[PDB]
């Protein structure tokens, strides 16, 4: 069971590795990456990896190696750099009762794994029954360093019915270790005296 440490993009986090060695020539070390310089502060029984302004490059598998009297040990930890900005867009921007579909798109997001990034279409708090997700469509968008993603989910709308809901809400949920983040974007539903006279 490989541990998983989540850190938001641009955030900071300290990973610490200790070694119980009562001998001489005891060393413990985080395997430094060619993308850092001075990120590791080691001693003889403890080593602290430091991540400031976390980028996607610092993301990956980090290994902590220890030696105790000519005896080497290693323990792995998965470092996860996630980005979950408040950038949701909806197509169409507004809904009309009778419409067959609605699309939500989360921008500049990662990870995109379904087990992490889930979409739900809410009405007045909870999920709108009668909906039907039509499978996510993950797309890599171009933001130079580094590769982020644009996931889009589409629903098959049910008959909204009467009374007409004030609006539907697209919710993007991201599940992380011991943490759930969510974002919502409003999809107003136009109804009734829409265009009227005098």
């Amino acid at each position, epitope marked *: 069971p490989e541990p998983v440490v989540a850190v938001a993009l641009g955030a900071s986090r300290q990973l610490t590795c200790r070694l119980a060695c009562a001998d001489r020539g005891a*060393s413990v*070390q985080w*395997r*430094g*990456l*060619d*993308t*850092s*310089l*001075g*990120a*590791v*502060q*080691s*001693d*003889t029984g403890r080593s*602290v990896l430091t991540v400031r302004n976390a*980028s996607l*490059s610092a993301a990956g598998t980090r290994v902590c190696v220890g030696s105790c009297g000519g005896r080497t040990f290693q323990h792995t930890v998965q470092l996860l750099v996630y980005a979950f900005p408040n950038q949701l867009t909806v197509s169409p921007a507004a809904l009309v009762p009778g419409d067959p579909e609605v699309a939500c798109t989360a921008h500049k997001v990662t990870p995109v794994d379904p087990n992490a990034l889930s979409f739900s279409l809410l009405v007045g708090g909870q999920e709108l029954e009668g909906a039907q997700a039509l499978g996510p469509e993950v797309q890599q968008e171009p933001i130079g*360093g580094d590769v982020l993603f644009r996931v889009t989910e589409r629903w098959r709308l049910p008959p909204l019915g009467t009374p007409v809901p004030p609006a539907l809400y697209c919710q993007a949920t991201m599940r992380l270790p011991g943490l759930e983040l969510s974002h919502r974007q409003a999809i107003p539903v136009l109804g009734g005296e829409n265009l009227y006279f005098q």
Partner: antibody
Framework: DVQLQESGPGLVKPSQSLSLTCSVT?????????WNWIRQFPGNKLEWMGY???????NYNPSLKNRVSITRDTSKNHFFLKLSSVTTEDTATYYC???????????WGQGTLVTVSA | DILMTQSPSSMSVSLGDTVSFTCHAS??????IGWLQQKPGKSFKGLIY???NLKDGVPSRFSGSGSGADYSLTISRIESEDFADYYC?????????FGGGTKLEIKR
């Protein structure tokens, strides 16, 4: 096999600018690592001037902070050092070096001597 | 800046012996130290990184030790191609600072 070789004018007049070039071959200065500039004064005192990282970010020595500028050229795989308002006390041998938490200042250039004098 | 004070300034030793010179940092630097070798006239070559790591291609005769603010480079079985000046560098905070050097002379 990574190679670094400095190059540039050996003589520079006071007040003028000192410019050097590091031609890196065998590794891409955008793939990884931090690319540094070090100088060694007559008498063998060393001083770190600054670096430019793989991502293009900079970091300089406060003692030189106003005058130093380490830019790069990803096309030719070169990176450069510019120093302004040069006095005679900048006479030194300038080295370029690639460092990181995997190698730790493993690769250096041959070093180029720059004299400041009228 | 972090002041790196290494000693001795220079030392004479016989072929085959074992020598060490220390480096004392003005504050703790968590083994973020590099040992550099400079042959007279030539350039540098990073022998050791992060206090105790031997850069690949460097003889095992070289070894670094220490923690906190006190580190030591130790050369054993001194050969003919070990006669140089040795510097220590710290890179745990900006600016990166060097030691004064340690000229290693050979007895004959």
């Amino acid at each position: 096999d990574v190679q670094l070789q400095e190059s540039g004018p050996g003589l520079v007049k006071p007040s003028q600018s000192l410019s050097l070039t590091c031609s890196v071959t065998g590794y891409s200065i955008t793939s990884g690592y931090y690319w540094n500039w070090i100088r060694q004064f007559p008498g063998n005192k060393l001083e770190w001037m600054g670096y430019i990282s793989y991502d293009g970010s900079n970091n300089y020595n406060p003692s030189l902070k106003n005058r130093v500028s380490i830019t790069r050229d990803t096309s030719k795989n070169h990176f450069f050092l510019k120093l302004s308002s040069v006095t005679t006390e900048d006479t030194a041998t300038y080295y370029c070096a690639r460092a990181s938490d995997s190698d730790g200042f493993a690769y250096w250039g041959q070093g180029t001597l720059v004299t400041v004098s009228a | 800046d972090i002041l790196m004070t290494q000693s001795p300034s220079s030392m004479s030793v016989s072929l085959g012996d074992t020598v060490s010179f220390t480096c004392h940092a003005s504050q703790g630097i968590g083994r973020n130290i590099g040992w550099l070798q400079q042959k007279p006239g030539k350039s540098f070559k990073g022998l050791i990184y992060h206090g105790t790591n031997l850069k690949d291609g460097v003889p095992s005769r070289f070894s670094g030790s220490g923690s906190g603010a006190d580190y030591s480079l130790t050369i054993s079985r001194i050969e003919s191609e070990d006669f140089a000046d040795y510097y220590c560098i710290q890179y745990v905070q900006f600016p990166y600072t060097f030691g004064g050097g340690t000229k290693l002379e050979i007895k004959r």
